[PDB]
Design a protein around this ligand. Structure first.
Ligand code: ZN
Length: 268
């Protein structure tokens, strides 16, 4: 297996400690060219205390692409409150020159009918076009997720007639029983426009693991990061990979610890 390095993205959630400057100067210095900004770090702001300029220039200086902002939730349950909140994020992404905003389904045990997610996808595609932002729909694995399958979400994006793509997240994939030898032919790598990697070394049962159980990559993470990435490659994927580990263990890691466990990960 070989994959081109320039194809690697560093999701900020990996670095809750660092300021954006701090976070940027890192990456670049750590090699690569793509990041993800997020609206769920301590600041609660895609820019922390900054403004669009400061950030934008900070991406220029370190020659980085802001690939996505995570995330809009619940994109699916698209009340006027949610619409106003989404608009926020589009202003953010347009503001920092992000290319995508990440869309997360309702994740609370409530059914969101396919017809409604299909409407929410129509309405968000208008609203995105309005800010010239791309969309990425991230199915969530959990039994309580109102959209679990990357296949189904492609089905529903095709139906809304949307240029949006799916965000394949290794954990959420892992966490969803009916894919792998039901995936493969059913899935369409054309329309996967981002892949979020994170590893789960933990011996617990899959059937109720969480965002907290996500460290980085290395031999015996019970998630098939290689075997997913092997297949994604086998299949045509020439798009981005991003490290989006969550877990409280991203709490150690000097600016130099993060530097290395990114490299454990990139096993090749
Ligand atoms: Zn993700």
């Amino acid at each position: 297996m070989n994959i081109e390095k320039t194809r690697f993205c560093i999701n900020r959630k990996i670095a809750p400690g660092l300021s954006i400057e701090a976070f940027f100067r890192l990456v670049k210095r750590l090699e690569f060219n793509k990041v993800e900004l997020r609206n769920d770090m301590p600041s609660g702001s895609v820019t922390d205390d900054l403004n669009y300029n400061q950030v934008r220039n900070l991406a220029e200086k370190y020659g980085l692409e802001i690939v996505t902002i995570n995330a809009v939730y619940p994109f699916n349950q698209l009340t006027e409150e949610v619409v106003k909140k989404t608009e926020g994020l589009l202003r953010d992404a347009q503001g920092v020159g992000a290319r995508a905003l990440v869309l997360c389904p309702l994740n609370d045990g409530t059914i969101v009918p396919p017809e409604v997610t299909v409407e929410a996808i129509k309405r968000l595609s208008d609203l995105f076009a309005r800010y010239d932002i791309q969309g990425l729909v991230e199915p969530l694995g959990f039994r309580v997720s109102s959209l679990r399958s990357a296949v189904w979400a492609q089905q529903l994006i095709r139906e809304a007639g949307s240029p949006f793509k799916v965000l394949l997240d290794t954990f959420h994939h892992h966490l969803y029983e009916e894919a792998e030898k039901e995936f493969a032919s059913r899935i369409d790598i054309s329309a996967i426009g981002l892949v979020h990697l994170s590893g789960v070394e933990d011996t617990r049962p899959t059937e109720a693991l969480a965002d907290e159980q996500r460290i980085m990559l290395s031999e015996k993470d019970v998630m098939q990061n290689y075997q997913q990435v092997q297949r994604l490659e086998n299949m045509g994927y020439r798009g981005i990979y991003a490290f989006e580990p969550f877990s409280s263990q991203l709490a150690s890691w000097s600016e130099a610890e993060i530097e290395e466990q990114i490299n454990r990960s990139v096993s090749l």
